[PDB]
Amino acid sequence: SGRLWSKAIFAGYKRGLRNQREHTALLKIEGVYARDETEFYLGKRCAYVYKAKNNTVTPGGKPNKTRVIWGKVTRAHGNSGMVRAKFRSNLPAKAIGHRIRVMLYPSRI
Amino acid sequence: EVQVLVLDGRGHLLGRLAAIVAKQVLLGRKVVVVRCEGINISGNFYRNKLKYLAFLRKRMNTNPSRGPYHFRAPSRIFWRTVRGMLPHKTKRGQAALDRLKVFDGIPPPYDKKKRMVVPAALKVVRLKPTRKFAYLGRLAHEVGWKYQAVTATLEEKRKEKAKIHYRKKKQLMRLRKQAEKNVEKKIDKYTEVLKTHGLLV
Amino acid sequence: KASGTLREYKVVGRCLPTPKCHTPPLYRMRIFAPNHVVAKSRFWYFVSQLKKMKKSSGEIVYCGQVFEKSPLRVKNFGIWLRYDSRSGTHNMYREYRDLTTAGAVTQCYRDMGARHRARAHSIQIMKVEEIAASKCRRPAVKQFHDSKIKFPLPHRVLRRQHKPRFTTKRPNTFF
Amino acid sequence: MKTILSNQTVDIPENVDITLKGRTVIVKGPRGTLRRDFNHINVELSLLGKKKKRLRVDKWWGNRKELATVRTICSHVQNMIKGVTLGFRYKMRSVYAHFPINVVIQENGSLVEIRNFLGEKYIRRVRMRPGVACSVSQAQKDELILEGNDIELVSNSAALIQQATTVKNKDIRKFLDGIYVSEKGTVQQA
Amino acid sequence: VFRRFVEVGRVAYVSFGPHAGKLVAIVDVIDQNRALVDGPCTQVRRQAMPFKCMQLTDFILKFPHSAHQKYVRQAWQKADINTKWAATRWAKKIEARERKAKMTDFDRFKVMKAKKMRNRIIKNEVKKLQKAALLKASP
Amino acid sequence: SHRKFSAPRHGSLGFLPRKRSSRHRGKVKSFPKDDPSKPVHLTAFLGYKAGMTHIVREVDRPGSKVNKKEVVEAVTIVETPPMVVVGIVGYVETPRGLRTFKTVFAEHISDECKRRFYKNWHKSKKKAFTKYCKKWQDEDGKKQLEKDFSSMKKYCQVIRVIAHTQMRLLPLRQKKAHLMEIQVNGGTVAEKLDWARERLEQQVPVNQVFGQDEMIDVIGVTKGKGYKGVTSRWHTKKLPRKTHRGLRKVAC
RNA sequence: GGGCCACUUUUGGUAAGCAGAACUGGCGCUGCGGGAUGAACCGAACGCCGGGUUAAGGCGCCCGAUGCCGACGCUCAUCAG
RNA sequence: ACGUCGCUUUUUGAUCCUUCGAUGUCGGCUCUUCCUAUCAUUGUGAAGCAGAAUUCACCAAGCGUUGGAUUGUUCACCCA
RNA sequence: UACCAUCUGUGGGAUUAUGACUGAACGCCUCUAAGUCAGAAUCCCGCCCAGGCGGAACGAUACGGCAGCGCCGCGGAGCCUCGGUUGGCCUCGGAUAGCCGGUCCCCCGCCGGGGUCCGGUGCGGAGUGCCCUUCGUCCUGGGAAACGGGGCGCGGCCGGAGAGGCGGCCGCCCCCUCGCCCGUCACGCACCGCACGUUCGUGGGGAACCUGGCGCUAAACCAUUCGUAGACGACCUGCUU
């Protein structure tokens, strides 16, 4: 019961104009739209859950078709919210405009 | 939040709304822009009409069947302004542009829904009132659009049904102001809890 | 010369004492600058034009900020200045309303750039003093000289245009 | 420089009684009623008195070009008051040299036909703006007499029948023919 | 139209800035954009504030222009604003919007139970005021 | 550089894609503007070209060269047997155009009208409108047509009449009729749709649709010539006789 | 042992993305960030990478960044900028 | 008029940047499109515009701008 | 096949120059500043030509003895494949130098419509909002409910056409006194700190299999013809009464 994670959007990689750095993601989180409003999310854990064809092993259950790339939030990118994230393996480019779950893990409250 | 965003286009500026829409479009967010008849463009009419007439002159003389497609219906004029604000030569920007559905007037998927407003794009907020403004529905009519007269007769009869639904929604709202006057001694405990925590002024 | 909020500096200097005059005369200026570094560098700009005095044959005796004597009463500042255009140079007289002296001179630099495209290296403020209300001449200053000022704020334009960005109700401008 | 306040009151006689639907003046006199929407100029209007009934219009921080529209709205209201207390009578006179001009009045005064203009066979049929009673006088020999309450409709209808009778491809110093506005009067000399 | 004016003694409410949420009095008008502005009883020292930060109220204090602080203070206390304000609806909507932000997770549960019950009694009689109020049998 | 001698362009650009027509009857593409003040009538008809003839008549043009004198005009003859009203169709007007709303074909559709609905009449089993003819003789299939003839009354603005020709009365080899929508102008929508079932299964002659001595418009498909060169198709100037690769070309 | 460009100085020429000198830096031999694009301009020179911060330039959308309740003015252009 | 400020690239020069392991070179014929710096035609303003004729401007390139003698001619010139 | 014969060739709209109207700024004047008018071989559309990797309405939809197909079932058993998503908002028109909400006398078959009055307006009858709100059952008491809830119960009717693919109302039933708040009373895998859990969802799509019930029995192309057509394709036609 309950959603229990806050919802974010994968907007793009860390980039200039004619270069990009795929090791850092840029996330838009709903509700927070200021830089002085985003220190809550400043170290929270985040994830990209996706489904594929083959069954894979699941922690706590029998094998399903959902696979997850895990990451965390490092710091803020700009003035209008917009945290930047760092995942373990770099995000696939098909995930631009898709759901990233900000998970309320390690807490400071 | 994966519902559709529905925007009443009346009273908005053309590119001020287009820049807002074309960034939400890139972030998922299926958005539907209804009532393009009433989108405004800053500057006076004749000046803005000359911009569109100057566009009509751009034409591949070798074969104008292959050249620029000069859409004349307001919905497709607004569809082209956001096209130029999207990377529509890539699959990210073509899957983006499929999320925007543009309509003239308000079709019956969206006539019985609530429309959102963008205050950063409205004519009353972003123009000084001692300026001039053109209507996108009017400069489509003198440019070649066929259907402002059937759209006017279908928006008049929709506003006939909108007054009827409102006067029934407004009639139930003065029933709740009568019910809360009758059964109030039995909600004195419940109306004080909500009054304590920032509700029920 | 840049800007951003101008102070006012009392800069005092004199020529280094050679065996010609053992005590050369002290000179002082009032200088509106962002900080005392610029105030000591604009001092040797004018005192080299007024007197035959350079920085190597001279020293800054006293540099220091001049604070406003009454920053809580509204004063009429008439400013005599001197700038150069794309054509030749011109003299002017402008009037402002401000609480501080250095605030009405900041207000002059933004208004000489707005109306005349005069950059701050072009402008030379030479005199600034507190004009009374009965000696003002400019009509924009004199319209606020009424003991019964009364006006509304007619067309309040919405500033929070993005909080929220998408709302369901159209805003109000009558308050 | 933007002037903080520029007002101009407008006196109102006893036979009229005007109201304000925002920026919409509705003047109602013994000769009918008029109505103009002023929702393109940002001023505030105000009925002040209850015995003499003044009408003030403010401007509140307008520049030089906005400040010009304070006295015009006064002049539009004063043309509504004279329109419904007195009216607008335009006596206008036909000036011919060789060919006399025949003007026959068609249906209820809202249409004129100008036939014998410089001896040409074309018939000029120009429609009146609605509310203008164009007629032919009897104390003069050939002059038109058009009534009405709205000065932007009476003078426009008088300008339709003046732009229609223009001489083309000739000198206009000689060939002084046409129907011209002679005198702008009122009915019921106050 | 136009009833709330800027004048000498107009009590203004500051909407944003360093003094957001303070009532304050207008002392003098500094050239179309700024105003000499002093709140002697709401802890706001005399300074210049733009007219875009402030929002005009209904209350007007009487004192001459550019008067000292002690004369705008005993004019604040005669017809005392701090009991006139915090009795009007706009003052009540401010305190009944910040105490919704001061609402703990257990307070939010108690509103969730009290609202869900209160929307059962109100929902009940609006049926009884539309099925007994439709009892009409007249030509 | 310029040409030095002005000459008009050969051919219109307003008639071109000069392809084979994608049809054979002749699409109307524009019916006469309709206004309710008139009586209720048809606006088009459909006939076959039979051949030409010249006639002799005298002229009444007062002031002309040939007033009260007898001239020889060339005429053509169009065989027009009466068209049979076989159906009805109503259109609703939309901001995207003018879409078709509902059509109601009649019972007792003839075999020459059903011939059109088959590309091969020999091997077919003639089954067209055999499920649809039984809802004219039913109870709970009946009143859905009076729900079809009532929604098309209250929602449509333009109703048309599907009519076909009757080939059995002509000297041609083909027995397949030509169906055609012909709109009904002059009148309100509730009258023109009541009118167009009175005529349903009945014939209308050309005497009703078109009267004496009025001008009409003729819509058809040109006599076909085949693949032709630029001298036949565009009537360009031929090239001089000592041209190497071809006289009947366009040079530049 | 064919050079070329740029600031300033300078010769012939009406002028030239012309021809010829002086001085320094550059391009050629050299990629990178910005100038949309471009041998030379602006910043800065390069082993392979992770974190931080800047330069010149930017920050409605394309397209990273003002979704600041930015400050004060000027400007309406039926070829604006 | 004396002076003086421009535009243009339908003239001719100036330059040598591209092309010498090739980009077919004057004129005509033919054919399409474009430009306006408008000869005519549509709508107008001005005249030392009485009419007729002509002239100077303006929005304007929609539409038209021919048939020949001589010359390879582009140009030129006469006939109609 | 030929100006070498014959026939046909069209209507608006916004406006440019320009001429004006009302009319300020500049207490006079002024085509202009706000607001208007007349206006053309131009421009744009119609007429005309073509008809989108654009829609629509409608027709018929595969058998003579093993053969298919469509609809109505949560009717089943499970496979595969494509992915997304994690509660809803079911709607006045609009004004912005003003609005929203209640209301007395009056009138267009008792809704609407008006001018007084009464409140609200940094919108609180508020999207900065609102509605839902998910631990489970069992014991047991008090309140809200009694003009209640529930079902793919069937029939019955009405409203919705701009892309209606929907939204309400009903007569006979069916069990139910539970579900909403404040409490009593205890139990459930309490899986022994730990991830993809929580939904939409009985998802879309391609198959094949079993078991009921209800209906349906076609065309297109080739070949052959035709010559209103044509390089070839295509196109226009005909083929047991």
Ligand SMILES: COC(=O)C[C@](O)(CCCC(C)(C)O)C(=O)O[C@@H]1C(OC)=C[C@]23CCCN2CCc2cc4c(cc2[C@H]13)OCO4
């Ligand atoms: C004296 O000049 C000639 O003989 C011309 C020709 O020989 C033409 C070549 C035709 C062939 C022989 C290839 O059939 C030739 O090689 O022309 C060059 C030639 O050959 C195609 C191309 C040149 C050089 C590059 C482009 N330009 C175009 C034509 C041209 C025209 C000239 C010209 C030179 C070119 C040259 O001199 C004056 O007029």
Ligand SMILES: [Mg+2]
């Ligand atoms: Mg799933």
Ligand SMILES: [Mg+2]
């Ligand atoms: Mg898994």
Ligand SMILES: [Mg+2]
């Ligand atoms: Mg001091």
Ligand SMILES: [Mg+2]
């Ligand atoms: Mg928002």
Ligand SMILES: [Mg+2]
């Ligand atoms: Mg006047």
Ligand SMILES: [Mg+2]
């Ligand atoms: Mg003449």
Ligand SMILES: [Mg+2]
């Ligand atoms: Mg040529």
Ligand SMILES: [Mg+2]
């Ligand atoms: Mg030519």
Ligand SMILES: [Mg+2]
């Ligand atoms: Mg040969």
Ligand SMILES: [Mg+2]
């Ligand atoms: Mg060498």
Ligand SMILES: [Mg+2]
């Ligand atoms: Mg050398």
Ligand SMILES: [Mg+2]
């Ligand atoms: Mg050189």
Ligand SMILES: [Mg+2]
């Ligand atoms: Mg060289």
Ligand SMILES: [Mg+2]
């Ligand atoms: Mg080197």
Ligand SMILES: [Mg+2]
């Ligand atoms: Mg380098």
